[PDB]
Amino acid sequence: GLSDGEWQLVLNVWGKVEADVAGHGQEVLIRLFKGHPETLEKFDKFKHLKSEDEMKASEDLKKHGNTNLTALGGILKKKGHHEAELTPLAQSHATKHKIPVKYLEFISEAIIQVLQSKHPGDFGADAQGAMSKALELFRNDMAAKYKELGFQG
Numbered sequence: 001g002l003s004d005g006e007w008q009l010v011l012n013v014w015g016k017v018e019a020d021v022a023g024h025g026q027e028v029l030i031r032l033f034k035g036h037p038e039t040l041e042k043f044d045k046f047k048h049l050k051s052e053d054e055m056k057a058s059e060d061l062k063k064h065g066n067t068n069l070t071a072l073g074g075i076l077k078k079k080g081h082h083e084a085e086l087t088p089l090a091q092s093h094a095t096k097h098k099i100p101v102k103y104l105e106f107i108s109e110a111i112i113q114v115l116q117s118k119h120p121g122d123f124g125a126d127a128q129g130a131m132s133k134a135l136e137l138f139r140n141d142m143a144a145k146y147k148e149l150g151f152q153g
């Protein structure tokens with residue numbers, strides 16, 4: 001439900017994430033987990049990380065942050081017409097990973113915080129609002145696929 005100008009703002013800021021996907025992805029997952037400890041429980045591979053220092057050293061965390069943001073990028077670039085890219089994620093997250101829609105709100109928050117943390121200058125009021133709308137559209141369409149699959153939206 002974004003305008004074409006709002007999509008341009010989202011994709012222009014996503015360009016900075018593309019110049020360093022893994023670094024951004026690492027930072028998002030650390031922010032998600034240090035802000036919201038219970039989300040870490042969903043990642044069987046990351047239990048043993050007992051500190052932000054262990055999380056920073058974890059090559060599997062960095063790899064997972066990279067995979068996560070590469071996929072999100074794939075969704076953003078389709079500007080709303082992302083059914084095909086969204087379905088497999090909704091499927092895998094609704095079933096196997098057991099991710100609640102609310103946790104999608106926490107990682108949305110971490111993405112914004114990271115963008116703000118790393119690009120204060122480029123991530124102004126307009127870019128922020130546009131990214132918020134893009135992530136809300138993502139969250140909303142994830143929730144609607146979950147309902148369709150028979151899960152709580």
Ligand code: HEM
Nearest residue numbers: 039042043045067068071072088089092097099103104107
């Ligand atoms: C921007 C939102 C998200 C995106 C783009 C995303 C993307 C992905 C991708 C591409 C994978 C690998 C393929 C698949 O299994 O579907 C994955 C796996 C996974 N996701 Fe997500 N995800 C998101 C949010 C979350 C959240 C909020 C959680 C937990 C709080 C989560 C937990 C997991 C887990 C546990 C796996 C499997 C990891 C493993 O190998 O151990 N995801 N996600």
